Paper text:
The CA primarily governs ciliary motility, functioning as a mechanical force distributor that interfaces with RSs to transmit signals throughout the axoneme. The mouse sperm CA structure is an asymmetric complex with various projections around the C1 and C2 microtubules. In addition to microtubules, CA organization can be classified into four categories: (1) microtubule outer surface proteins (MOSPs) in C1 and C2, (2) five large projections (C1a/C1e, C1b, C2a, and C2b), (3) MIPs within the C1 and C2 lumens, and (4) the bridge linking C1 and C2.
Subtomogram averaging (STA) enabled CA reconstruction at a resolution of up to 5.5 Å, providing well-resolved tertiary structures to build models of 39 CA-associated proteins. Our final model of the 32-nm CA repeating unit in mouse sperm comprises 260 tubulin and 206 non-tubulin chains. Among these, there are 45 different polypeptide chains, including 39 known proteins and 6 unknown proteins. And among the 39 known proteins, there are eight proteins newly identified as CA components: GRK3, ANKMY1, LRRC43, GOT1L1, LRRD1, MAP1S, GMCL1 (BTBD16), and SPACA9. Additionally, we provided more complete structural models for four previously identified proteins: CFAP47, HYDIN, CFAP99, and KIF9. Specifically, HYDIN forms a semicircular chain that encircles C1 and C2, with its N-terminal half driving the C1–C2 connection and its C-terminal half providing axial support in C2.
Numbering used by the authors:
A (entry chain 4W), B (entry chain 4V): 16 to 404
C (entry chain A2): 674 to 808
D (entry chain 4Q): 236 to 602
E (entry chain 4N): 297 to 345
Amino acid sequence: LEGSLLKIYRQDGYPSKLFLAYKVCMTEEGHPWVSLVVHKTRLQIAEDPSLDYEYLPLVGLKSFIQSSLELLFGKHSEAIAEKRVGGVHIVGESGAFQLGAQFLKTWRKNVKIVCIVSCQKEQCGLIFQDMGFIVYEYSIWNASDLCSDPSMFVEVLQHIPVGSILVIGNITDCKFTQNQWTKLMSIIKSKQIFPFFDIPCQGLSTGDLEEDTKILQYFVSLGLEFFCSQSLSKNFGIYDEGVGILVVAALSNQHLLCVLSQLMDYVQALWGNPPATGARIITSILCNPALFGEWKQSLKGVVENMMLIKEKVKEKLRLLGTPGSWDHITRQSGTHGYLGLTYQQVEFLVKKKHIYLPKTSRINFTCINARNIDYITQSIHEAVMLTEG
Amino acid sequence: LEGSLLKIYRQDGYPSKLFLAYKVCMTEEGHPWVSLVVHKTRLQIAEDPSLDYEYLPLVGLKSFIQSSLELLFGKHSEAIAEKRVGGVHIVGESGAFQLGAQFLKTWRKNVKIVCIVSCQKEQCGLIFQDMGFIVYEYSIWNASDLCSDPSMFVEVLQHIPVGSILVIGNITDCKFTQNQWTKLMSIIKSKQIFPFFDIPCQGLSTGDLEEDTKILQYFVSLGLEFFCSQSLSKNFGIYDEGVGILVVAALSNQHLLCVLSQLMDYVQALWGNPPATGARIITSILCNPALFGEWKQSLKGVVENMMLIKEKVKEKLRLLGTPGSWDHITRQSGTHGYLGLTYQQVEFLVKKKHIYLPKTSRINFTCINARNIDYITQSIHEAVMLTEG
Amino acid sequence: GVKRDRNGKIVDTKRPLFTSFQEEQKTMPLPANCPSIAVMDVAENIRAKIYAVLDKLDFENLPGLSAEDFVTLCIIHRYFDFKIGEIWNEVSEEIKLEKLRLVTTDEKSLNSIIAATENIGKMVASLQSEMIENQ
Amino acid sequence: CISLTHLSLAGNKITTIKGLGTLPIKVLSLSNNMIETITGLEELKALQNLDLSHNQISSLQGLENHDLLEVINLEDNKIKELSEIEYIENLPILRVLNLLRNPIQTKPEYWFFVIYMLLRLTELDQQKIKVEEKVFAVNKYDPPPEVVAVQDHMTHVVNSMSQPQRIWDSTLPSLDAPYPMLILTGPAACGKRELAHRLCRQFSTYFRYGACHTTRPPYFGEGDRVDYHFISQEVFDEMLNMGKFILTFNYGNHNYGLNRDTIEGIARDGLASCIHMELEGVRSLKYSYFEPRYILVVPMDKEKYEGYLRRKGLFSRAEIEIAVSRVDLYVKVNQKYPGYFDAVINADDMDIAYQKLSELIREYLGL
Amino acid sequence: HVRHEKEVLWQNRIFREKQFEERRLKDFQDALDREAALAKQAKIDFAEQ
């Protein structure tokens, strides 16, 4: 892992150096933005310092785990009555895959095959293949779209062998059309395919949990066998504490009990007891209706800020005359989105303008603000005209 | 799982039921033992207005790292700095075991031999047999002396095969001499035994943090290579935090960096970020002298609560007419130890007195209190009468 | 065990305060709870306390001036500073065997300290010879 | 000849190089020539191995435009200036450098300055630059944050020791209950000094303010020997040379330090002391054994503090941004280090800050 | 007094440990940056030819 962006940005001396990919949730200035509910959250955690500090079992402090269970289940649906759905405490940004991929590999012996998205493979499938797996890839981050594209997705679905697993990760760029939903379902039915999903940025992929889970809501209404990978360290955003959950769906209660037993074994192996600080911090924002609702509203506001930054970057790049299509930035959803830059533009930025971002340029648009975006777009336009000309 | 023993203890309608066996350190009110410094530090932590909302470091907190290394390797240790030891801020408590197992299955997969104390058979066997490692037992616990006897460890020195993964349990009572220790390592080094340690209760095992692992400091002073697990949140008072630390030891300096080159990818693919907010109290005592002292007299109060109360309970048993002075109770190090009671005496406790305990007669001495100390002594005494004879 | 000449003259400028016990002692780690070389002495001496009691009674202006009185007055007066210097010197000697390598920044401060201590000791010896010549 | 991957004209009479431009000349050997400048080469990006030894070249700005230049050989030339060292420092690929027999080669400051700037160099004048050597050159040129603080404190200790001393009143016999001391650290006059004065106001029977010293003449509004000991720079340096200083911190090229007698005077009576502190002084204090109650006083509202400093009047334009950066640095340092400070209180409002300080004192002494 | 300062500058051995720690950070990046630029050298040579 070369975290060169932030470190070189900090170690640089250019006065007008600007970083566009801060790892955490941002204000208009580069501060670790929090919802106005976090200030109250810390105060309403400190009212109970006389605790005896009882351990978290293999299931953990099931207040947090259960609250996140109703979170990922959806506090608006009825998949719980089917008693085919469960979930287990994970830690950090990878425990969800560490449980789900391991379980699927171990107990779907006939199914050691998945077709995943190559763009979000870096975040999802790398952990998925960390559990000893054989993966087919649909690289739907098209050159023309510069975002996840359902075309090659469904195209690979057509050639999927009987008895495979399908991954729809943090690719909310694919707001799959209803017709594509039906085509996906029809191809899956004829081959007994197991859908899989990963939204580590619930409330950040599109702004709200329900919108992040729209096709997920449709799948839940369908009642399929699917897992829901998620990391509350990225959606609520405890990157310091690093706590999340995984959610499992099945077709029977005994299968769900087997899933729960195997995942409890995998929890005892991986970490034994989940941490409590992150779990309780997440509980404080989940259970309280005021904190939860205002967190949703403020996170939607931050996501709309991100969308505004995407639109402004696109509009200023097309206004200055910079070659190439720019609506691809707006095609991308969530705080992650490519800019379609070449190596030469990136190297010119790094050298002369000291703006650091990869060739793929999946920058966090919450970092850019309406105050420096003019200079940023001017520098990008200069880089493009001087490097590609 | 077989949680049904404590579960039926909880279901027990007997008012004088006493699960004197759960290993966690207690106050006499039935709460996990907390100190006033804990509530105080919770109070000052409550004043934190702003947050650094980014990922916590994976190596550990600097003061926490220094404390862990000086406790596990010595106050005057040299292996601390030139990467002859290791400290990694893992997830939870079982994260160290799972990272070590990943390292084994990646590099040390050529050895599937494990040598342990019999009390660690199922415990470490769960993790080892989860990856296929064969486990071999030797009972260095004495069923006659009712402690860990050095003599069958000097026999186990011949029992142990060559080049195994040695998991260490309660070797505190296996009190060799310095020359006997040197003979022990001469036997170990001649057999290439790679040991694996775990010290989650340093400070209350013998009453001193140095004496608990003084044998480990002298181990690393000889250039031994071993992994270790450590936890301090338990014996401090903040039990629920549950964030341990993986501890490595070796001789080669660059090889630890080479191992870290893969451990970084491991940790990224497993969790990414564990929490450390609860560790602020830990450092609040372990760093400042006044709080360190005050919590040390709190520890001495706990010491009087088990081992001095051990002596007073034994004297009360002598007064009641209990045959044999149960000196082995006081001789057992730590807060946990087998009583030597047979199955039919544990069953008497569990049924007539509902003083619940595992089938090995291993109770937790921090559960012993002075409130109904008469009842506890009477229960043990009548158990001796009706079941010993 | 402190040694002088056949008349009571200082015979050292580097470690004249070393008694027999300091000379027989070397640099090794201390026992578990046995106090250090200086702790038991300070708890059981009247050496540094004479300096304090003379300070209580105007150390430098009292009747009874003589060669021996001058020598003992100078020794007792400079004993505090030179004993601190000797403590840091024995710390340096223990560091010599520690091998627990410190940054070289600790070396220059020690060099300055030992230079000042040696200058003080040599000037004290010269001033001893000077009062002997005076008498 | 666009395909020209290499060029070599060693030992010729090349006065100045021209025409090459953008040629992909990866290796260029032009030793034993009459070359005076480095013209024409600047755009030879593909030039990684350059040899211009035994020549008459002085200025080297333009070889740094060889974004790929890895090996440079200009032995026996007329190079004397050190500016090219900073110029060739901007080469992320320069790994080997040769400058022997040059007049510049005579001032080993060139040597360790190349070592310090060019951390990316693996070789300088035919030796391999070592691991500890590069940061030894670092500690030869720039003063490190923690390490210049360390050097300042060590020099303070050296000068304080080198003079006759006495049993200090500030050192009380009770180890766990020594002379009560308080330290409030933060940015430039964020009210922390005013907070200490307010503490001495209400807790007049408990505390008494301790004034730091300075090299600076009295600024208006500050009482002499009450807020700062407004002595001259020469007296400031001398009273370290006389063995009375243990710490300094530099503001506007003016140093501020603490004389031990200031603590001795207040401790001579028995009442506690409160002193406002600052970052360099805090570093020098933590390197020492001294045991006050460390308190960091910082106004988190950086914009409010910015406007407050701008409206304070006595400060120029650049004096506000430095203090704001120090505010942010203190916030990050205290929020990243567990068990670091004994207490931290907001300085956005003096009233809430003083309420927190008062409750902290009351819970300390159990009043 | 100096025992504390002796131990504080013992922690300055972390800076002495940092001596090679950030050499590693650069020794395998001071070669890759040189190597990364070679990726754009031979692609247009025969392409132009």
